[PDB]
Amino acid sequence: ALTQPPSVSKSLGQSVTISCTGTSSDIGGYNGVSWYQQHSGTAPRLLIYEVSKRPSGVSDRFSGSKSGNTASLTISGLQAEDEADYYCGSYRSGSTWVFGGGTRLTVLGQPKASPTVTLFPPSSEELQANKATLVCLISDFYPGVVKVAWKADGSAVNAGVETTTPSKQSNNKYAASSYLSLTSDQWKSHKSYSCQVTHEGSTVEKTVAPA
Amino acid sequence: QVQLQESGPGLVKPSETLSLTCAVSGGSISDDYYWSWIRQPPGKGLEWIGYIYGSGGGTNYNPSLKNRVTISIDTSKNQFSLKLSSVTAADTAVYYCARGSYNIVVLFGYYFDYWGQGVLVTVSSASTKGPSVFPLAPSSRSTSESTAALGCLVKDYFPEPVTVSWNSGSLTSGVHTFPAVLQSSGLYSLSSVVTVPSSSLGTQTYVCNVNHKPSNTKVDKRVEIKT
Ligand SMILES: [Cl-]
């Protein structure tokens, strides 16, 4: 299709240029390339149209150009907010449309942040259904990588765990959650369960008990 | 102002037909636009599906799908729609509608200035399941002085998505709804928590409003101290 690098990485405050290589039937056939920003879980947003034009409300940090059959998006003064997938697209001769494959932008240099860990025990009502779910909510950390270890009376629990891939919060730090699915009998047969979250060499351990 | 609003089932059985609609407000579907559909399979890029032209109704589709695609306009209702027949798991994707705007096509082509919110359509033979909602009783230890965290667990639903609000949308500050986890069972679970003043506990009621449109289910779960 239109060819973009799978990823680019730059540090805070730097500029980055993303290329988009097409053909003389699209990028080189028209002054018609457009660029889109897409944050995870939301619709693409138009940044640039007709190669270099910006809609009102789009920051002047975004600019576009082309040379021959290759278009380029440049982003100056990189901020954490700019992390996203970027897509070029163009009309193509014969009344069709083509997108580039997308480029994921990573912005480095952001401050480290330790996770907040919130651990809830099972509810009375879930227990009546002979089930017990322990809910370990992990928030406000950077970079977006954590390791979770569950314990029952201090011994490692491996079965019944599901942990999500971290996702960015509105404040550009990350959140994740881990669930331990047990039977009610399992829950009641231990003195305590623990969710231990390790990040950048430090660990936060929270414990709950049947009480 | 121009808004594109998508609707349609988020669960389609294999070999059946996917149908979505895009309701336009702030402008006429009859105007000179390329009313377009675009999709995004999980972890893949945007893919053009096709368009219908507002002033005449002419269509053109992606040849990879031209066999299976129909795009239509309903002038009353001010809408356009997508039908994709004989679907397979390859058709699982977020589907977007968008407005293609142009000046002189042969010189500048056109571009997508307004977009629908996107609808996830899952192609699966698995059946719809509504969630079970459980309270997560207040816990003070991990929050600021004079506050506590409370929440609700939304367990075992399919397909995505679930949305959560608190006290009918009247409580918004301090709310954090986490992305869903996928279980080996094929069912999803998520949690939503809110941080509230410890002072308010016992007097102020806290209810999480859980909406699972795919099962036409809503649960309003009151969250209180454990007894
Ligand atoms: Cl906690």
Author numbering:
A (entry chain L): 3 to 6, 8 to 27, 27A, 27B, 27C, 28 to 95, 95A, 96 to 106, ...
B (entry chain H): 1 to 35, 35A, 36 to 52, 52A, 53 to 82, 82A, 82B, 82C, ...
The authors write:
We report here the immunogenicity in rhesus macaques and CH103 CD4-binding site bnAb UCA KI mice of sequential Env immunogens derived from the CH505 HIV-1-infected individual who made the CH103 bnAb lineage. In macaques, vaccine-induced nAbs  had epitopes overlapping that of CH103, bound only open trimers, and neutralized rare tier 2 viruses. The antibody clonal lineage most similar to CH103 we identified was an IGHV4-J, CH505 differential-binding clonal lineage (DH522) with autologous tier 1, and heterologous tier 1 and weak tier 2 neutralization activities derived from memory B cells of RM-5556 immunized with additive CH505 Envs. DH522 lineage mAbs did not neutralize tier 2 CH505 TF, neutralized 7% of a panel of 199 HIV-1 primary isolates, and blocked the binding of CH103 lineage Ab (CH106) to CH505 TF gp120.
For comparison, we found that the DH522 lineage antibodies bound natively glycosylated and glycan-deleted CH505 TF gp120 Envs equally well, but did not neutralize HIV-1 pseudoviruses bearing these Envs nor bound free N-glycans.
